[PDB]
Design a protein around this ligand. Structure first.
Ligand code: CLA
Ligand code: CLA
Ligand code: CLA
Ligand code: CLA
Ligand code: CLA
Ligand code: CLA
Ligand code: CLA
Ligand SMILES: CCCCCCCCCCCCCCCC(=O)OC[C@H](CO[C@@H]1O[C@H](CS(=O)(=O)O)[C@@H](O)[C@H](O)[C@H]1O)OC(=O)CCCCCCCCCCCCCCC
Ligand SMILES: CC(/C=C/C=C(C)/C=C/[C@@]12O[C@]1(C)C[C@@H](O)CC2(C)C)=C\C=C\C=C(C)\C=C\C=C(C)\C=C\[C@@]12O[C@]1(C)C[C@@H](O)CC2(C)C
Ligand SMILES: CC1=C(/C=C/C(C)=C/C=C/C(C)=C/C=C/C=C(C)/C=C/C=C(C)/C=C/C2=C(C)CCCC2(C)C)C(C)(C)CCC1
Ligand SMILES: CC1=C(C/C=C(\C)CCC[C@H](C)CCC[C@H](C)CCCC(C)C)C(=O)c2ccccc2C1=O
Ligand code: SF4
Lengths: 217, 83, 740, 41, 226
């Protein structure tokens, strides 16, 4: 978990503030972010929440697109909100503010657990003391970990590494979703079946976007 | 550009005269500078099998000067009706 | 001998010096205690001669600062090309350049400023630009916005490369002092590659790209129907039927049969009647000849291969009998003093800008450039003011060199020492000729005003009463009108239409017509000569008396930039060379203001206008021959007859100009108390305000102080110049857009 | 980073940030409330 | 022998480099040029030798890949429709694109970008840190990237699997022959570019034109002159 660890580039010098203790610590920081320990823990928390929401959204997009390809009446991941509010009993405006209302509590608790570790598990919220206590910086546990496979240190460390790697892959997946939906105007599973149907021709160079065509010769 | 053409002949004669000039006096080479005349000087650049000082920069400079003198003379004669 | 000398990594690329603002000088390294420190932090920021005494570090800083300025210029150029690519009607303007105004700036509708997006034509709304970028892009063969987008991207890439080059050549690989001191190598490389190779590359672009596109544009075909420049580049058929000499395929160049290239390398003087601009083939042969001449000139100085001249030997050899040591110590001066080189560069660059303004009002070297009167007026005025500022800075940095880098040991009997040795005679004779010129020009104007107000039109110095005609200028005009007749027989027409001949008009508007010179022209030309003479007197008095004088014998020890030497000797305020430059800035402003007023009135009365069947009807009806001889005529027939568009621009797209106009007047007023008053009054007022803030315990820890006397003079001259330049800019642009 | 943070902590940088924030707030207010003169709702 | 050796240039160089013919008129191998610590400027003898040998190998590959298709298409080895000119393969779509490829040229460009970015970035990281690519796990073949003291000649179980150059004499001979053929390939690629620009034909076609008509088909006649 450090020293002679595989870095983001072979032969690179890892930063002093990146000693390999964190999950996914490949020593990748040209802009020297997360140098301060407070900014380091802020960056770790931000990466963790962005990762968790990235894998949640990508899993939802993939499930909806796979069901739509199979035959379920599901719209594309782009412009899904229009038909969603068309069929929703809850109108827009009330929906976003409702989401903000039940999101502010969790975000406030997360922020004040990040600033003050263990301060949430003091019985203030419905008499919960053992739960809602952060085991690590961005890893609360307790009520969020019902089954206890994180008790072992090795299992917790490998689960953290797997989570951060799949989360970074989910960031890349979401960026790819946006890019090739703006390029092809099709579902990601449609792009996947087009790539596995004719791999030698159907690619990023034949959509009319990404690679521009001016002379056509 | 034609072989044996009078313009090519006069410019080749001018370039050859310029090349043969600094070999023996007259034109300022690397080893002959002075203010009005020729005065003894160093070599610095090896002549690559050439007696006295006749290195590659000398033949480059004098070939450029000969080509320029030839085209100037040719175009001046063409302006006044000659070759 | 000449070689690359580079130190590897002398300065570490860290942000530790960005936290501390004052770090380049020991005076500001201790931190701030008064507010003037902040001004000092913004004053000695780029005074690298004061930060360190080592010439190598100063040269490295100068190199990196030049790289930064080039990156800034390339960013600005890329932004211009991007604005032409997206927020512009260049494609619409290419179809009918005589009816759609050039526009390249579009505003956001926020608080009613969307009225500034005027109806320029072509189904577009925006600000009518006067930079002439449309004519430059038409001269460069640019047709679509894709080429402008690509040029903007390339300019951004080159600006990033220039910024990286500055960072690299400062922090990573900093050249040594011997690398910078190779003046012969610098001159050879600049004459051969920076100027000669650039001229050859532009000539090749004109020959292979700009000439066919411009020929097809003048033929009247659609810009979209015009083939792309690479089609002209690769396939020789289109360039062959557009120019038959391209069918030979580089044969006449190597066979010395250059006359066969006469179809696309021409010498037809004058303007193209289709577009009212210079012939593109003439510009191509011009840039080719310039490239050849500069390639010849770039092989003059000896660097590493024996042949070539020596600058020191040339300078030391040119010694006359009346000058003592002829040009002896100037080689050591210009290879050790950055400020002397800065003075020479600024003087020549300012003069070059003046020549640029004159020679592109005279010959418009761009298609459909003369038809746009506003573009020509704005370009002339802008290049004029840039030249004036540069030649003021020339005297400023010459005075800085005299104060700082002058060494009496190396200057005993040389030219500089003799100029210092008769500086009093120089300044006295310059003062006398300035007084004589001011009398026999402005007193002539006052004489005309008085005898006009006294009811004596026969006693004036006008074109009808007392003819002080410019006989020399008229003779030169007649000689240059007959220059292609006898002395330049290979020129098809005259080199310009200002000497004489017919009238070239495009789209019903006069592109260029002959300019007649009369008594008013002689009066304004001698007025300009007088103003230039006085500005030269001020700047030369600043330069020569920068070190010492009979009034102050130790002025060199006081530095270049000091306010005064106290009220002693009757008072010694504004005695420094910096104060001389500060005084001469206003005189430069007055000189160029009169020059551009003469330019605007002369082209509006005797050049610009419309062409009808009866004849040429000018904008002001040619009143310059009768109204420019009196100050009241300039007040009424030039300043009051015009500027009606500026004050009536409200409710239209030109209104911002009028707004700027009013604001400019404000700034011109706001400078005056910085120019008047002093420092003790403002210091005592600040003390009272300090008492007020101390009563409420809101006194700042940094002690507020009044601006320094030099600082106050600088603020006053800067706001005064900004107000005057913006006033002339707004008035000129509104007048020339509303009726032009 | 902390050197860069102290560079952004300098007076001109925070002044530029305040100016950008205030100008953007006023511009968005004037855009989303076109021509406000009379305080009425 | 020395090919155009210039005096006052062998003062700063001894005989260690493979070619080392003493040709340095302007002067770039001087240790006084870019002297100090750290990376510094790009004009340094180590980077100059590295870029020279890399340019030599790339130009040698390019000369072989510009000769082979035309020669084999003149014979019956490769089919004629795949024997197009080197500039007509798709490198310059104005010159020509071979449409009968298994993939789009931009797809091959992206595959090239990934593969050769991996290769050249590993090469650069080993140039800055010698032997560093043999430490970080790549696929289990890290021992193939051991390198050597000279970055130009890494060797190992892959780059020198033939194990030629056991002793110093034939290693120096091989280095000199490599740099000589590489410089000849710089000249060859220069001529290929010039001939492609001013003839619009393959280099072997130009060679056949010069062989059939020496006076009638050469540089002078190709420029239009006589
Ligand atoms: C009436 C005044 C008042 C106000 C303005 C707040 C405001 C807040 N409280 Mg608090 N609270 C209050 C009284 C108040 N509290 C009292 C009297 C108690 C009982 C002792 C609590 C117990 C309490 C708990 C237990 C928590 C909050 C939390 C919060 C935040 C949630 C806001 C949100 O998302 O919107 C509402 C949706 C917010 C800063 C949460 C927070 O961020 O803290 C970590 C949280 O977990 N409050
Ligand atoms: C023929 C070779 C050549 C060329 C073309 C230039 C060109 C330039 N020099 Mg340079 N110079 C040269 C040789 C050359 N130099 C030599 C040999 C020396 C040492 C004796 C110097 C010493 C020197 C000093 C001390 C300074 C310059 C400066 C400048 C710039 C003047 C500003 C200008 O005209 O804007 C024209 C601008 C452009 C055309 C925009 C594009 C500029 C490109 C990026 C530069 C390309 C030319 C470059 C020399 C190529 C080699 C660089 C390579 C290693 C990447 C200009 C870019 C000034 C400077 O720093 O400016 C930044 C300056 O103060 N020169
Ligand atoms: C800098 C200015 C410039 C440039 C770029 C060009 C360029 C061109 N002109 Mg022009 N020309 C110019 C100035 C210029 N000219 C001037 C001043 C005149 C006098 C009026 C002319 C008169 C003229 C005429 C009359 C004609 C041209 C023609 C041409 C073309 C022929 C090229 C040629 O034979 O040159 C020689 C070029 C080379 C030898 C090529 C350079 C060598 C290459 C780049 C080496 C590459 C090697 C590389 C490392 C290996 C490949 C790399 C790869 C693997 C990636 C070409 C587009 C002709 C045309 O359009 O027909 C096609 C034509 O008819 N021009
Ligand atoms: C338009 C405003 C104005 C005017 C007219 C003057 C006038 C003068 N200044 Mg000044 N100047 C001004 C503003 C002005 N200044 C400002 C604001 C600054 C600050 C930057 C300066 C900075 C400055 C410097 C730095 C210098 C001058 C100099 C001069 C002289 C000019 C040389 C000349 O030929 O004068 C001739 C006189 C006039 C043009 C005044 C009008 C004369 C009329 C025609 C009357 C003619 C005689 C009359 C009939 C007799 C009256 C009889 C009566 C007594 C009964 C003159 C005394 C220079 C100097 O001392 O001499 C070279 C000098 O070096 N000034
Ligand atoms: C007010 C001054 C002035 C100006 C601006 C011009 C401008 C012009 N004249 Mg005119 N001329 C003038 C006065 C002037 N003239 C007086 C006479 C009477 C003797 C003439 C007689 C005359 C004739 C007979 C002709 C012209 C022509 C021309 C044109 C080209 C001239 C040329 O090639 O110059 C040279 C151009 C250059 C760019 C050179 C500039 C060199 C720079 C400034 C550096 C110079 C440094 C110098 C060499 C060092 C000093 C050396 C010294 C110590 C010995 C141009 C429009 C010709 C024409 O009709 O136009 C086509 C023509 O045939 N002129
Ligand atoms: C054939 C023309 C030619 C000649 C004779 C020179 C000669 C010289 N140059 Mg220059 N140079 C040239 C073209 C030329 N250069 C071009 C086209 C560029 C733009 C890329 C430069 C950019 C350049 C820079 C930036 C510097 C020099 C420097 C030098 C000096 C020593 C380094 C050297 O040999 O160049 C090596 C550099 C080259 C680019 C090789 C050019 C070889 C040509 C193409 C053949 C020497 C006086 C250096 C100097 O004066 O130090 C004080 C210096 O700093 N040159
Ligand atoms: C004002 C223009 C200018 C000048 C005078 C210099 C001058 C110099 N640079 Mg710099 N450089 C410039 C612009 C300039 N550079 C720009 C715009 C960039 C970014 C693209 C660089 C990037 C750069 C690097 C990365 C390196 C230099 C190096 C050098 C030195 C080598 C000079 C030489 O042999 O010729 C130039 C030699 C050539 C072979 C020219 C190649 C040009 C092709 C087109 C690329 C010299 C001090 C080197 C150094 O410090 O070593 C001593 C070095 O390592 N320069
Ligand atoms: C966008 C892609 C890059 C994102 C930022 C990564 C980063 O921090 O790089 C910073 C790296 C740090 O790793 C550097 O990497 C070097 C090895 S190598 O460059 O990876 O080969 C090595 O010196 C060391 O690890 C370190 O300095 O610094 C460099 O010098 C690497 C190159 C950065 C610039 C790339 C320009 C070209 C981009 C594509 C243009 C087309
Ligand atoms: C790419 C990304 C972050 C990339 C960051 C990079 C490269 C940073 C690089 C560097 O920092 C390093 C490493 C080191 C520094 O020295 C240098 C820099 C350069 C600064 C985040 C993506 C983050 C992506 C996230 C969080 C995605 C969330 C997705 C959600 C919520 C989806 C929700 C949906 O609503 C949609 C969109 C549409 C509906 O159809 C479906 C539903 C499900 C409703
Ligand atoms: C005796 C002998 C010999 C011989 C030799 C010879 C024969 C030589 C020659 C040489 C030469 C013969 C050279 C030349 C050179 C040239 C050059 C180098 C050129 C250049 C050019 C230029 C640079 C140009 C330019 C221009 C242009 C393009 C445009 C404008 C004009 C001009 C013209 C300026 C041998 C070796 C066998 C052996 C030994 C002995
Ligand atoms: C007025 C005056 C002062 C007093 C003026 C001083 C000390 C300078 C004041 C500068 C202010 C602080 C600049 C900033 C003004 C605003 C606070 C900034 C804009 C705010 C809006 C954006 C909200 C001098 O000190 C002085 C000195 C020498 C000759 C003439 C004068 C002189 O005329
Ligand atoms: S303090 Fe002011 S008024 Fe007094 S001599 Fe100095 S500049 Fe003049």
């Amino acid at each position: 978990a450090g020293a002679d660890r595989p870095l983001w580039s072979p032969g690179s010098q890892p930063p002093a503030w990146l000693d390999g203790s964190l999950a996914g610590d490949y020593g990748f920081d040209p802009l020297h972010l997360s140098e301060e320990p407070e900014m380091r823990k802020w960056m770790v928390q931000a990466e963790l929440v962005h990762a968790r929401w990235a894998m949640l959204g990508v899993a939802g997009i993939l499930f909806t697109s796979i069901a739509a390809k199979n035959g379920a009446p599901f719209p594309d991941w782009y412009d899904a909100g229009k038909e969603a509010i068309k069929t929703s009993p809850a109108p827009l405006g009330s929906l976003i503010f409702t989401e903000l209302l039940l999101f502010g509590w969790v975000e406030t608790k997360r922020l004040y657990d990040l600033r003050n570790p263990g301060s949430q598990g003091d019985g203030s919220f419905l008499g919960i003391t053992d739960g809602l206590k952060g085991k690590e910086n961005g890893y609360p546990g307790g009520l969020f970990d019902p089954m206890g496979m994180s008790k072992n240190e090795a299992s917790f460390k490998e689960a953290k590494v797997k989570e951060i790697k799949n989360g970074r892959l989910a960031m890349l997946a979401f960026v790819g979703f946006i890019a090739q939906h703006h390029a092809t105007h099709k579902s990601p599973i449609d792009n996947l079946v087009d790539h596995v149907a004719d791999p030698f021709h159907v690619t990023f160079a034949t959509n009319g976007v990404s690679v521009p065509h001016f002379t056509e010769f | 550009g034609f072989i044996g053409s009078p313009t090519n002949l006069i410019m080749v004669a001018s370039t050859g005269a310029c090349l043969f000039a600094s070999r023996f006096g007259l034109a300022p080479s690397v080893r002959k500078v002075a203010q009005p005349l020729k005065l003894a000087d160093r070599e610095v650049i090896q002549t690559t099998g050439d007696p006295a000082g006749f290195t590659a920069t000398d033949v480059l400079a004098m070939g450029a000067a000969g080509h320029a003198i030839g085209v100037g003379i040719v175009l001046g004669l063409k302006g006044i009706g000659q070759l | 001998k000449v070689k690359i000398a580079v130190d590897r990594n002398p300065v570490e690329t860290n942000f530790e010096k960005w936290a501390k603002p004052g770090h380049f000088s020991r005076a500001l390294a201790k931190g701030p205690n008064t507010t003037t420190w902040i001004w000092n932090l913004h004053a000695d920021a780029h005074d690298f001669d004061n930060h360190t005494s080592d010439l190598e570090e100063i040269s490295r800083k100068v190199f990196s600062a030049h790289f930064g300025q080039l990156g800034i210029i390339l960013i600005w150029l890329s932004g211009m090309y991007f604005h032409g690519a997206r927020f512009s009607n260049y494609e619409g303007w290419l179809s009918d350049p005589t009816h759609i105004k050039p526009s390249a700036q579009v505003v956001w509708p926020i608080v009613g400023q969307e009225i500034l997006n005027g109806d320029v034509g072509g189904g577009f709304q925006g600000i009518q630009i006067t930079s002439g970028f449309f004519q430059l892009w038409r001269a460069s063969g640019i047709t679509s916005e894709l080429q402008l987008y690509s040029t903007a991207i390339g300019g951004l890439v080159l600006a990033a490369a220039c910024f990286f080059a500055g960072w690299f050549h400062y922090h990573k690989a900093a050249p040594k002092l011997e690398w910078f001191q190779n003046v012969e190598s610098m001159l050879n490389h600049h004459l051969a590659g920076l100027l000669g190779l650039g001229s050859l590359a532009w000539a090749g672009h004109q020959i292979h790209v700009s000439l066919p596109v411009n020929k097809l544009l003048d033929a009247g075909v659609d810009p979209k129907e015009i083939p792309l420049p690479h089609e002209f580049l690769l396939n020789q058929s289109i360039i062959a039927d557009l120019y038959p000499s391209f069918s030979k395929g580089l044969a006449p160049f190597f066979t010395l049969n250059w006359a066969e290239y006469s179809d696309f390398l021409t010498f037809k003087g004058g303007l193209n009647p289709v577009t009212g601009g210079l012939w593109l083939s003439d510009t191509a042969h011009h840039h080719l000849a310039i490239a050849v001449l500069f390639l010849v000139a770039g092989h003059q100085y000896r660097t590493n291969w024996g042949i070539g001249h020596s600058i020191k030997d040339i300078l030391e050899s040119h010694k006359g009998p009346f000058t003592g040591n002829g040009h002896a110590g100037l080689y050591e001066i210009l290879t050790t003093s950055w400020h002397a080189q800065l003075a020479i560069n600024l003087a020549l660059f300012g003069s070059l800008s003046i020549i640029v303004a004159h020679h592109m009002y005279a010959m418009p070297p761009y298609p459909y450039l003369a038809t746009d009167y506003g573009t020509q007026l704005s370009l002339f005025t802008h290049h004029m003011w840039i030249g004036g500022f540069c030649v003021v800075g020339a005297g400023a940095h010459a005075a800085i060199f005299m104060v700082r880098d002058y060494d009496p040991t190396n200057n005993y009997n040389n030219l500089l020492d003799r100029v210092i040795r008769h500086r009093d005679a120089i300044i006295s004779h310059l003062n006398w000729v300035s007084i004589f010129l001011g009398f026999h020009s402005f007193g002539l104007y006052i004489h005309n005003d008085t005898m006009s107000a006294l009811g004596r039109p026969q006693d004036m110095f006008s074109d009808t009463a007392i003819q002080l005609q410019p006989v020399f200028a008229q003779w030169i005009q007649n000689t240059h009108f007959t220059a292609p007749q006898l002395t330049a027989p290979n020129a098809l027409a005259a080199t310009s239409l200002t000497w004489g001949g017919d009238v070239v008009a495009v789209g019903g508007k006069v592109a260029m017509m002959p300019i007649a010179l009369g008594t008013s022209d002689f009066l304004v030309h001698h007025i300009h000569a007088f103003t230039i003479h006085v500005t030269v007197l001020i700047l030369l008095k600043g330069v020569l008396f920068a070190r010492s004088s009979r009034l102050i014998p130790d002025k060199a020890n006081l530095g270049f930039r000091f306010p005064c030497d106290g009220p002693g000797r009757g008072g010694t305020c504004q005695v420094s060379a910096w104060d001389h430059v500060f005084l001469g800035l206003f005189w430069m402003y007055n000189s160029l203001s009169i020059v551009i007023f003469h330019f605007s009135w002369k082209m509006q009365s005797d050049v610009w206008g419309t062409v009808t069947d009866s004849g040429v009807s000018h904008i002001t009806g040619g009143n310059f021959a009768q109204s420019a001889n009196t100050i009241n005529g300039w007040l009424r027939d030039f300043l009051w007859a015009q500027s009606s568009q500026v004050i009536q621009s409200y409710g239209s797209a030109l209104s911002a100009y009028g707004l700027m106009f009013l604001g400019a007047h404000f700034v011109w007023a706001f400078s005056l108390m910085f120019l008047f008053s002093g420092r003790g009054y403002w210091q005592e007022l600040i003390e009272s305000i300090v008492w007020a803030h101390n009563k409420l315990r809101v006194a700042p820890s940094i002690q507020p102080r009044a601006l320094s006397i030099t600082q106050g003079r600088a603020v006053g001259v800067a706001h005064y110049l900004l107000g005057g330049i913006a006033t002339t800019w707004s008035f000129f642009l509104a007048r020339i857009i509303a009726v032009g | 980073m902390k050197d860069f943070t102290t560079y952004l902590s300098t007076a001109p940088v925070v002044g530029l940030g305040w100016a950008i924030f205030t100008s953007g707030l006023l511009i968005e207010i004037n855009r989303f409330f076109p021509d406000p003169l009379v305080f009425s709702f | 022998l020395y090919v155009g050796s210039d005096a006052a240039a062998l003062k700063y160089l001894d005989g260690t480099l493979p070619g080392d013919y003493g040709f340095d008129p302007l002067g770039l191998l001087d240790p006084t040029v870019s002297n100090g610590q750290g990376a510094g400027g790009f004009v340094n003898p180590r980077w100059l030798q590295y870029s020279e040998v890399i340019h030599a190998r790339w130009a040698m590959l390019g000369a072989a890949g510009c000769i082979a298709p035309e020669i084999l298409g003149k014979a019956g080895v490769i089919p004629a429709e795949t024997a197009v000119d080197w500039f007509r393969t798709g490198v310059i779509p104005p010159a020509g694109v071979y449409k009968d490829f298994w993939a789009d040229p931009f797809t091959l460009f992206f595959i090239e970008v990934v593969a050769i970015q991996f290769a050249e970035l590993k090469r650069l990281q080993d140039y800055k840190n010698p032997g560093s690519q043999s430490r970080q796990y790549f696929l289990g073949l890290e021992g193939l990237f051991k390198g050597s003291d000279n970055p130009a000649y890494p060797g190992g179980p892959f780059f020198n699997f033939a194990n030629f150059g056991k002793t110093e004499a034939e290693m120096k001979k091989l280095k000199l022959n490599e740099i000589k053929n590489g410089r000849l390939a710089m000249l060859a690629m220069f001529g290929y570019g010039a001939q492609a620009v001013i003839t619009g034909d393959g280099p072997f076609d130009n060679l056949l034109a010069h062989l059939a008509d020496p006076t009638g088909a050469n540089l002078i006649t190709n420029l239009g002159g006589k």
